[PDB]
């Protein structure tokens, strides 16, 4: 929770992790800019769920331990939104967040929990413009893996067969187009039905809450 809070408060004030000391409070770091205090408190509520009584006056070391007591280790809505934006706006065409996790698993052997940390560190060193090449994107994630190695203290081809399945996939697509086949109609109808199931299930669940299992049976 200390890495997650440090990165969120650092990224908001647009400063590196070293610039924001964890001994200082949100009210302190913000100066008099209460506009920015309200955003950080809204972002911490979005992220972790609940908050201490006066989070602005709690030092960030201490805020981290309160969140740690109720924190699963999962990234939560605010972190996930900012990492999606980092990738979609600063990575080169086709370099998805999933391509960037495949690269952190392949090149540095990191599982889902540690990649979460590498991307959080990447968010607080967010490049100013989009990176030009796939080479520059890997160079960036290499540099961000070594910064994560410091902060947590840790030491650091069937592409021809994939190339054909892509061709086959596209030939299928153009044939479907010609035949006026709507390959996705089935899934579309399913998603709609799945929703009307949840809708009815809720109505039936409500009646069970009101009347009780004994009565309804």
């Amino acid at each position: 929770a200390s890495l997650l809070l440090h990165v969120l408060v650092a990224h908001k004030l647009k400063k590196s992790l070293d610039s924001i000391p964890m001994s200082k409070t949100i009210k302190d770091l913000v100066g008099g800019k209460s506009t920015v205090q309200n955003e950080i408190l809204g972002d911490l509520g979005k992220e972790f769920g609940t908050t201490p009584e006066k989070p602005e006056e709690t030092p960030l070391e201490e805020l981290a331990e309160t969140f740690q007591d109720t924190f699963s280790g999962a990234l939560g809505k605010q972190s996930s939104s900012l990492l999606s934006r980092l990738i979609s706006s600063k990575m080169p065409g086709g370099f998805t967040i999933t391509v960037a996790r495949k690269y952190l698993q392949t090149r540095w052997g990191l599982p889902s929990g540690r990649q979460d940390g590498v991307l959080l560190v990447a968010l607080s060193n967010e490049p100013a413009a989009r990176l030009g090449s796939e080479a520059d994107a890997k160079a960036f994630l290499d540099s961000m893996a070594q910064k994560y190695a410091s902060i947590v203290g840790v030491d650091l081809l069937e592409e021809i067969t994939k190339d054909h399945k892509v061709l086959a996939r596209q030939q299928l697509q153009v044939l479907a187009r010609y035949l006026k086949m709507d390959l996705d109609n089935g899934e579309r109808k399913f998603l709609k039905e799945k929703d009307t199931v949840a809708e009815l299930q809720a109505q039936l669940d409500y009646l069970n809450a009101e009347l009780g299992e004994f009565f309804v049976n």
Binding site: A209, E210, L211, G212
Partner: protein, 484 residues
Amino acid sequence: IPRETIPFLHLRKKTPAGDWKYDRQLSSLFLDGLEKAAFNGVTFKDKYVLITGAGKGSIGAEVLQGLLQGGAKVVVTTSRFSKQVTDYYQSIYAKYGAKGSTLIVVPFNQGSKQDVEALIEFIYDTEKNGGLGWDLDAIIPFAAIPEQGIELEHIDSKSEFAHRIMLTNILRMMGCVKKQKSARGIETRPAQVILPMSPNHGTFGGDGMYSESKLSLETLFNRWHSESWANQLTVCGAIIGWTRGTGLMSANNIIAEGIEKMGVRTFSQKEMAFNLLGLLTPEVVELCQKSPVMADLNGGLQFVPELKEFTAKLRKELVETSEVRKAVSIETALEHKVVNGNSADAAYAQVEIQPRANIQLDFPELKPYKQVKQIAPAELEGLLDLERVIVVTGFAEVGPWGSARTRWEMEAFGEFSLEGCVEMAWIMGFISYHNGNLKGRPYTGWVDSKTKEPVDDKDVKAKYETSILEHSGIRLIEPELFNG
């Protein structure tokens, strides 16, 4: 109290035989409470009350006014939560809300087990957990829905639901505050439950499951003894008598005067509220804690026999008298017209004048000099350079409530004049002036902008005011007004 006489309000004692007969002593205690209350007032300061069924026009609302006047802290439920209802309860608190009083209005459906549990959880939860942090002293569960024209064979969904509100979820509500008190080891602050009971159980018929609801509540007189909740709840049954509604023409009010000719008492809502608030006096609060109390507040109506046939006769005779007079009236009117002609009754029909709007600029009124010279000091005359006194000579606005004229009517009075309504109708383009033939006939005045049908100023309010208010002032953003 003449011995041999039973008062129109009394308390009852349970005989070993098991009937509830009048008790002169307890009734004295209660009636003396009322006399004291009437001369010196009763305080309810430090009393925490939950009341359901206190809508505008109800007995409950008259009880609520009293609780607040005495400095009680009260939770009112409404099943019709709305700005109209919210503003209603605000105006009650702003008028009657004494020092130390607070009023808390919550939306609540007594038909819902979940609402019952959630409401009591809210009342008892700490302020830190977003509750009131209260512990109730009185519960007044008056919530109910009317069932009329529903005999035995008609009893269905509405009646089964009504019965849930008016019995099964009152038991549930009592049970919840029992659980909350016991959970916190509260053995010495019982909540007094003012049960709204009926003296007539399927006497009149067609009340769906009303009578079954109201009779069932009478078990609580015995359950207080037989179960483990006596220290948490006390039971105070009010047998509520004939209670003339908002004092307007009801099918029940029109026979009230008739019922009273029998030597029997019907009640205003204020009277019945006073009767009920008389059960929260310290004396009868303490009496409830000893043993369950039962208050006959039924104006000796018990004593008129065949109460249904009698009631029904009174209504028949009134309606008969009305119907025959209305018929004989209409026929003697027509017999006059046939004999005397439609001439005779054109020299009868008066000429009524309907108002047209006459919108004014409202320049300030200039008083006569003698009167205006008294306002300012005598010395001011010829003291100011009037080239250096700055004066507002005219003003105007375009805003959510139209012009400065229309906005001021809405700000100050909360509703439009004819002149306000016609100006709004004109601004918003509902109506346009017309001067020339309208379908071959000549016409001067307002016309609906769409239909080009003529419109009288008198009809502008009925035709357009609802739309004027719907599409003026603070409201949902309309995309057509901001470029989509």
